[PDB]
Design brief:
Chain C: It is found in: Nucleus, Nuclear pore complex; Chromosome, Centromere, Kinetochore; Cytoplasm, Cytoskeleton, Spindle; Cytoplasm. Chain C: It comes from Homo sapiens (Human). Chain C: This is Nuclear pore complex protein Nup85. Chain C: Belongs to the nucleoporin Nup85 family. This is part of a larger assembly, with chains A, B, C and D. By secondary structure, chain A is mostly beta strands. Chain A contains no helices and 30 strands. Chain A has a four-stranded antiparallel β-sheet with strand order 1-30-29-28, with no helix packed on it. A four-stranded antiparallel β-sheet of chain A has the order 2-3-4-5, with no helix packed on it. Chain B is mostly helical. The radius of gyration of chain B is 18 Å and the shape is globular. Chain C has six helices and no strands. The radius of gyration of chain C is 14 Å and the shape is elongated. Chain D is built from no helices and 24 strands. In chain D, the strands form six sheets. Chain D has a four-stranded antiparallel β-sheet with strand order 1-2-3-4, with no helix packed on it. Chain D has a four-stranded antiparallel β-sheet with strand order 5-6-7-8, with no helix packed on it. Chain D is globular, with a radius of gyration of 20 Å. The chains are: A mainly beta, B mainly alpha, C mainly alpha, D mainly beta. Chains in contact: A-C, A-D, B-C, B-D, C-D. Chains A and C meet through loops of A and helix 1 and helix 3 of C.
Chain lengths: 345, 165, 109, 323
């Protein structure tokens, strides 16, 4: 069906759905966003407007209603839900912040904050320099983050300090991070590599490394298939999409062109994961259907992936997406958000 | 003298450093390969890349914008800036070798020798009848001592009752 | 275009992409050297080398090699290995980066 | 326009203010012998991050390098010196409590009199720094490294035969114009019939030659600025004196007979404005060189622009109310 765009008069760097109650029969009712490149950046909670109704006096109540906000510090580099009331966000300040929604009040608050999670160092004094925190992933009650400092941190939603830190896991920027298994993560970098880390190991060095062959394509985003802990998808500086089986050598299994630019997020569908979605600095947003899991076929001219642009035009950059049941949302540099309640009609 | 004719100038300079020998034949012979190139047809430019490579100009990624004359002038400039300890003799040699072949002096070479001796240059310009270049060299030298760029003539201090004479 | 505050490498990629599309090549060199100098003041040698490679500045590539070759002697080991193995064709940006790449090739040999 | 304001806590008269290239930082200097750096937050505020003593005299300017040279400042002084400063991460030593992380890497001492102005060069000339002083000379220093900022080579002296009050580099990134510097003079003598002088880098001599001298600027000069070049075949030059002035300087194309010497200019005055009713004490341009600002003893900063006919007029007056 048609897609309900909204201007919000801030650039949106990140969007996320509110996690549904286990065993409910609701659609995705609420989403959260984070902003970037303002004089003031914010994190906001929104409801999807109800296009089903008019009352006697003819008003269009079908707007994506703002529930509540809170002001941020720096740019909102990455964003994720932690439970059904708490959210975690990264920052250009190297800060990591946990927030709490108050349904009885319609407000946000801070819940906990790590103001120096990421920082660059220098010769012999604790006059640290700000390092952008680039990505965040949650495994409640646990949390992991990456940054320009090449640091990996492990944090906890009951603890104030770091549970573990790993400085200089790269000499370049680390961009994004995901959990393969609860003590076992994967990160991506400025070189064009996937680095795998096990918090059980007492060294700081990586448990495994994967790459492209020689020429450097920085990898900006990563996801890992919901019912295959060994299948990983990454997005390049060029607009390539790479599918990996982390058990089978050092290279991707499947290599596809997705954009004419930097690909900013990639996601498998949380219930339908033979479906995939991607956004980019080429101004486009795409759906991919492929229904061995079809993502691991070495000949996409035999086995299918059938591919749809969800936007009817190209905008200023699409930084982010999220998809939950039939609902999809994306966020842009055109100071705007796009939402559908239905992706299968 | 054999390495200088082959064009193996950096190993000739290495041999001068094991036997104390003067670098003067190396500077005269490299200037004479630059003179042969500066009037040289396509064959003399193909001949040149083989001995230019043997002098290890290897830090120059190959743009499509310079030629065998110009990289030979560049190598000769690099040697005149690398071997500073005797630098009168090697500028005097190269300039005498150019003027005895009627070749105009490169603006990088004139304005390198000014930081060494403008008087040995003025002696050369009188030895070669370059009277208008001598008038403007004297015009620049008098203005150097008067604080219109003293430092381009090697001069530490311009004319002052607070300095050397 | 060079005066946009470059808080993050991600923001600087959008500005570089805009300059590279429009063939603004000295502004591409500028922004890549500003990023290489962000990285050198923060001692992030992998971003410093990768940005000086995007700038194509052989003096800056030599200067970052003349951190890695001291950072080696200050430890007995480099602060990166994978970055020096995966130099590829970009190894040849200066004699000292050719040495750094061939010295890691000598460790790999 | 809208204004925000900041208490500056300099313990005597401030002499200068300058932005960083991104407008995210600013520097200020005082007769209390200090320099301060102030930085603009990711909330729209500004905070004083360093506040230290720079010199032994009153400080007469402060200026930033372009950020491909990192985070470098220069300051000039009544003690006859100039100084170069670098911002360092992690060096800040509690062994010497209350020193700055802005470290002095060098002091220049070559000036025989008060150093009246200091300006970094356009970055395509390399890491070059110019100063001028009341001995009637401009001095230009040239760093052989961008990291070892202790070492600066003096590679150009330029004698003006008159005192120096201010200097401006020509902002031409186009290789079709030589490196150029304009110089103003504080000289109150009636004998010196011109108070602005212009010099050109002549590669064929490796000298800063003189090209020009503005024989209509009979009156003392306090500040001078070239306009940033939107591709123009001619330069524009603002001057602060008894009045505001805007000059054009259009290069005369050489005939193939005119070897050796510098260029020459077709020069006009496009504007001269008395409207301050008082002396003019700064001239600075917007980033595109389309709008001039100038201050005077009338307690007004005045803004000036071309209309669509290149008829320059006053467009705005920024002035204190005293409430």
């Amino acid at each position: 069906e048609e897609i309900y765009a909204k201007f919000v008069s801030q650039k949106i760097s990140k969007t996320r759905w509110r996690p549904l109650p286990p065993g409910s029969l609701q659609t995705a009712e609420t989403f959260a966003t984070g902003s970037w490149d303002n004089e003031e950046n914010y994190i906001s909670l929104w409801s999807i407007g109800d296009f089903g109704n008019l009352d006697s006096d003819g008003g269009f109540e079908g707007d994506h209603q703002l529930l509540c906000d809170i002001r941020h510090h720096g740019d909102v580099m990455d964003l994720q839900f932690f439970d059904q009331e708490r959210i975690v966000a990264a920052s250009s300040t190297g800060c990591v912040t946990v927030f709490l929604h108050h349904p009885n009040n319609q407000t946000l608050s801070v819940n906990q904050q790590w103001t120096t999670a990421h920082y660059h160092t220098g010769p012999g004094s604790p006059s640290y320099s700000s390092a952008p925190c680039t990505g965040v992933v949650c495994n409640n009650p646990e949390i992991v983050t990456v940054g320009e400092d090449g640091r990996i941190n492990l944090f906890r939603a009951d603890h104030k300090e770091a549970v573990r830190t790993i400085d200089n896991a790269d000499s370049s920027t680390l961009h994004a991070v995901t959990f393969l298994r609860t003590p076992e993560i994967l990160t991506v970098n400025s070189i064009g590599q996937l680095k795998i880390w096990d918090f059980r190991q007492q060294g700081n060095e990586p448990s495994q490394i994967l790459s492209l062959t020689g020429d450097r394509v920085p990898l900006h985003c990563v996801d890992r298939h919901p019912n295959q802990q060994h299948v990983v998808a990454t997005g390049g500086q060029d607009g390539m999409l790479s599918i990996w089986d982390v058990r089978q050598g050092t290279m991707p299994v499947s290599l596809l062109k997705a954009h004419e630019a930097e690909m900013w997020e990639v996601h498998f569908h949380p219930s339908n994961p033979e479906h995939l979605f991607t956004c980019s600095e080429d101004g486009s947003l795409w759906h991919w259907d492929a229904s061995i899991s079809s993502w691991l076929s070495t000949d996409p001219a035999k086995d299918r992936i059938e591919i749809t642009s969800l936007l009817p035009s190209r905008s200023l950059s699409v930084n982010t997406l999220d998809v939950l049941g039939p609902c999809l949302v994306c966020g842009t540099d055109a100071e705007a958000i796009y939402v559908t309640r239905h992706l299968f009609s | 003298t054999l390495l200088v004719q082959a064009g193996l100038f950096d190993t000739a300079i290495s041999l001068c450093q094991t036997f104390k020998l003067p670098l003067t034949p190396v500077f005269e012979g490299l200037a004479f390969k630059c003179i042969k190139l500066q009037f040289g047809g396509e064959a003399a430019q193909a001949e040149a890349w083989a001995w230019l490579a043997a002098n290890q100009l290897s830090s120059v990624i190959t743009t499509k914008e310079s030629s065998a004359t110009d990289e030979a002038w560049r190598l000769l400039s690099t040697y005149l800036e690398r071997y500073k300890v005797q630098n009168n003799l090697y500028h005097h040699c190269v300039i005498n070798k150019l003027l005895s072949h009627g070749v105009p002096l490169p603006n990088w070479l004139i304005n390198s020798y000014k930081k060494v001796d403008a008087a040995e240059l003025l002696r050369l310009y009188l030895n070669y009848d370059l009277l208008e270049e001598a008038v403007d060299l004297v015009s620049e030298y008098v203005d150097a001592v008067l604080g219109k760029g003293h430092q381009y003539f090697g001069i530490e201090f311009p004319l002052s009752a607070t300095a050397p004479m | 275009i060079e005066r946009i505050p470059l808080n993050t490498e991600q923001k600087a990629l959008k500005v570089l992409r805009i300059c590279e599309q429009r063939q603004m090549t000295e502004q591409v060199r500028s922004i890549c050297k500003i990023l290489a100098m962000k990285a050198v003041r923060n001692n992030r040698l992998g971003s410093a080398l990768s940005w000086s490679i995007r700038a194509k500045d052989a003096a800056f590539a030599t200067l970052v090699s003349d951190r890695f070759l001291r950072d080696y002697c200050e430890r007995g080991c480099f602060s990166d290995l994978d970055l020096i193995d995966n130099l590829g064709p970009a190894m040849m940006l200066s004699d000292r980066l050719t040495f750094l790449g061939k010295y890691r090739e000598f460790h790999r040999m | 326009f809208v204004a925000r304001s900041i208490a500056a806590d300099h313990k005597d008269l401030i002499h200068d203010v300058s932005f960083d290239f991104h407008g995210r930082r600013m520097a200020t200097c005082s007769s209390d012998q200090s320099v301060k750096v102030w930085d603009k937050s990711e909330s729209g505020d500004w905070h004083c991050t360093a506040s230290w003593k720079t010199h032994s005299g009153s400080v007469w300017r402060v200026t930033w390098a372009h950020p491909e040279f990192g985070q470098v400042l220069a300051s000039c002084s009544f003690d006859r010196t100039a100084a170069v400063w670098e911002e360092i991460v992690g060096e800040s030593n509690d062994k010497l409590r209350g020193q700055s992380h802005w470290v002095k890497r060098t002091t220049l001492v070559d000036s025989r009199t008060s150093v009246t102005d200091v300006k970094f060069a356009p970055k395509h000339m390399g890491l070059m720094l110019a100063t001028c002083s009341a001995d009637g000379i401009v001095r230009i220093y040239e760093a052989p490294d961008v990291m070892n900022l202790s070492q600066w080579s003096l590679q150009h002296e330029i004698s003006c035969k008159l005192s120096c009050s201010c200097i401006s580099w020509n902002p031409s990134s186009s290789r079709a114009h030589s490196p150029m510097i304009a110089v103003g003079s504080d000289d109150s003598s009636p004998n010196a019939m011109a108070k602005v002088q212009i010099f050109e880098y002549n590669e064929n001599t490796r000298k800063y030659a003189k090209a020009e001298t503005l024989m209509t600027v009979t009156d003392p000069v306090h500040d001078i600025a070239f306009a940033p070049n939107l591709g123009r075949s001619f330069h524009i030059l603002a001057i602060a004196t008894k009045d505001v002035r805007i000059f054009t300087l259009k290069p005369v194309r050489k005939e193939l007979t005119s070897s050796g010497g510098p260029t020459k200019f077709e020069i006009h005055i496009v504007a001269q404005f008395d409207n301050h009713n008082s002396q003019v004490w700064r001239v600075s341009w917007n980033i595109t060189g389309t709008v001039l600002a100038s201050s005077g003893d009338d307690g007004c900063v005045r803004l000036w622009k071309a209309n669509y006919m290149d008829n320059w007029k006053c467009t705005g007056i920024l002035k204190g109310n005293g409430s």
